Amino acid sequence: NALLRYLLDKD
Amino acid sequence: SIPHLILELLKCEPDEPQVQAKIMAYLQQEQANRSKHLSTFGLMCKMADQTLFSIVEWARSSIFFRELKVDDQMKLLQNCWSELLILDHIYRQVVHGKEGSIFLVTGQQVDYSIIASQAGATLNNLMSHAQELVAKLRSLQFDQREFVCLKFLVLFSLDVKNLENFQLVEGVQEQVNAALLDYTMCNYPQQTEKFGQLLLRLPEIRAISMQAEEYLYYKHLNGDVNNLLIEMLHA
Numbered sequence: 001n002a003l004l005r006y007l008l009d010k011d
Numbered sequence: 012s013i014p015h016l017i018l019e020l021l022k023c024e025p026d027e028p029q030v031q032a033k034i035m036a037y038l039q040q041e042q043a044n045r046s047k048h049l050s051t052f053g054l055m056c057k058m059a060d061q062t063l064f065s066i067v068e069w070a071r072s073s074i075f076f077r078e079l080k081v082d083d084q085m086k087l088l089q090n091c092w093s094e095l096l097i098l099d100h101i102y103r104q105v106v107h108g109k110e111g112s113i114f115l116v117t118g119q120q121v122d123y124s125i126i127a128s129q130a131g132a133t134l135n136n137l138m139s140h141a142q143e144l145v146a147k148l149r150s151l152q153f154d155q156r157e158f159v160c161l162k163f164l165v166l167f168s169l170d171v172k173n174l175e176n177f178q179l180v181e182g183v184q185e186q187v188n189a190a191l192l193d194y195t196m197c198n199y200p201q202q203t204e205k206f207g208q209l210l211l212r213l214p215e216i217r218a219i220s221m222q223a224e225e226y227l228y229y230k231h232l233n234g235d236v237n238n239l240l241i242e243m244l245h246a
């Protein structure tokens with residue numbers, strides 16, 4: 001789930 | 012008189028008006044870009060999709076959760092995302108709801124007979140069971156302090172396996188449970204049943220949300236629903 005990991009890491 | 016822990020959970024709550032104004036704005040622009048030549052079910056999928064973005068942002072910034080590594084964070088949200096949607100829906104009707112009306116995350120109010128005409132049998136059934144939870148919670152005087160506790164009990168679920176830091180999930184579950192038990196005892200001393208009646212709603216909310224997921228996955232395989240909502244259904 002790339003989108004979810006991105007939403008947790010994005011600055 | 013409120014346990015310090017419940018205060019810490021309260022300060023992590025988002026500013027409801029700004030979350031709702033943002034979602035309302037997003038949906039307005041999307042409709043502006045569509046030519047006359049999107050069903051009501053599709054609209055609700057868009058609305059819930061945007062609601063998931065704000066749920067992730069909330070959890071990401073919340074106490075305890077922000078100490079977990081990304082992998083553990085992903086497993087928790089993939090297990091409870093639907094429960095958090097349904098719980099926020101229920102609490103929304105408790106505060107702002109009116110019989111015969113449904114209040115949406117956009118602050119809009121809609122008539123039940125309009126929605127029940129279009130939702131279909133399965134969603135009408137699930138909406139009905141949620142309404143029965145609404146009436147029950149309303150008679151218990153469900154308030155915001157009890158709400159945030161249940162939000163964290165849903166998020167930090169013991170059903171989540173293969174976590175690197177399961178001890179934390181277990182600790183949060185235990186301490187939030189102890190704070191809620193203390194909060195209801197001190198603030199509603201004449202309601203012996205309130206604590207248990209609150210906890211007994213979490214399995215019910217779980218069942219409604221798991222059945223809602225299974226239905227939405229069915230609707231996706233039917234071609235009726237690519238965004239965050241899809242990613243969470245597959246994961």
Ligand SMILES: C=C(c1ccccc1)[C@@]12CC[C@H](NC(C)=O)[C@@H]1CC(CCCCCC)=C2c1ccccc1
Pocket residue numbers: 051052055056058059096097100114115116117126129130134137138141219223227
């Ligand atoms: C899980 C939901 C959902 C519903 C339809 C499509 C995608 C997601 C929510 C969860 C809360 C969201 N709220 C919004 C969009 O304002 C959603 C909307 C809502 C209220 C009824 C609208 C149905 C018209 C087609 C849902 C719901 C509530 C109880 C039981 C089952 C589903």
